[PDB]
Amino acid sequence: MKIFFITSNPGKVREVANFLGTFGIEIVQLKHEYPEIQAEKLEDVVDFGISWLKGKVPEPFMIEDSGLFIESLKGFPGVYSSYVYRTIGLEGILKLMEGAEDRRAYFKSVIGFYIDGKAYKFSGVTWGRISNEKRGTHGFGYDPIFIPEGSEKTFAEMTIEEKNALSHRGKALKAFFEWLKVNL
Amino acid sequence: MKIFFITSNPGKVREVANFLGTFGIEIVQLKHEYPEIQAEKLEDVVDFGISWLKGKVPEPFMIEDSGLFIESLKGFPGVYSSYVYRTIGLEGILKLMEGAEDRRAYFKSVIGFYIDGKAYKFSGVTWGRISNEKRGTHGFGYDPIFIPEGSEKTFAEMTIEEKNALSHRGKALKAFFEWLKVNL
Ligand SMILES: [Mn+2]
Ligand SMILES: [Mn+2]
């Protein structure tokens, strides 16, 4: 089936099309701007985004929101991971964490799917630590400094397949797929 | 005249009621949640906020949005100053600016006013530098580490009167007042 993915993030599109492609699902990206509200949880951003988008883009469609929540920084940058990456970047994060006892953190992803007048959400979380130096060229954003608990490579040192297997977005996708299998 | 100020920030209410009180204008705070969109300019946040609020709160009303834009950090934290203050705080800023050549930065404030079916905006900007240590107990947020160009005190070391005289919010208020005098 064909699902329109409303996003302007090339990275997210690669990981998503790739994962869902495996199961014969066609993902077509469509850059259509929508408002992402300031909120404490990604879920609120997804809900509002889908509410605003319905009727303005082709169906069925999906959108995603994700972020890196760092414990020592009280969940920061979290929901505003994108903005923070663009302004202070990885350097900005590493500097904020120089001599940080615990570099524990988690990545969260929320997928909103709209179809037949109804919206559904799927999420996945993955903990890890912030490396001390960048590493890798794959992925995007904070992938170069995030080591998912259960390995020694950063998201950036993994292939799309290797990432979707441990990543937060990988779990949201698995969850979202399970749902599709049972409803469509 | 009576103007309802939709906000949950005690600080902003004090500076605003105080300034406008001087001219015989009654400011009544009303905590009513509204969506603040993620955007590059405060003006966009104000526009969307007023659009959503009209019809849900008493008129006439105003809302404000403001932020600290630090040059060395590419305008960060800017629009998300509130969130950043709550998570990494002043310490987080100072750490990001240790050994920063230029500590130049500016505070911006945007006031949205709705009345008779129409919305109007007023803004004010004020440059300065980020001090090396906190200072003062007045004000709120980043006031303890911001020294407005043209003095040696931080916003926190000033009284409400002294702040409204140099502050970014003080200018938005003057602008907003000039407008009132000419229209009402
Ligand atoms: Mn987002
Ligand atoms: Mn705001």
Curated annotation (Swiss-Prot), chains A, B:
Reaction(s) the record says it catalyses: XTP + H2O = XMP + diphosphate + H(+); dITP + H2O = dIMP + diphosphate + H(+); ITP + H2O = IMP + diphosphate + H(+)
UniProt keyword Metal-binding, yes or no: yes
Superkingdom to which the source organism belongs: Archaea
Any single Pfam family the record assigns to this protein: Ham1p_like
Xref: PANTHER family: INOSINE TRIPHOSPHATE PYROPHOSPHATASE, INOSINE TRIPHOSPHATE PYROPHOSPHATASE/HAM1 PROTEIN
Family to which the UniProt record says this protein belongs: Belongs to the HAM1 NTPase family.
NCBIfam families, per the entry: PRK14821.1, RdgB/HAM1 family non-canonical purine NTP pyrophosphatase
Protein name as catalogued: dITP/XTP pyrophosphatase
Species classification: Archaea, Methanobacteriati, Methanobacteriota, Thermococci, Thermococcales
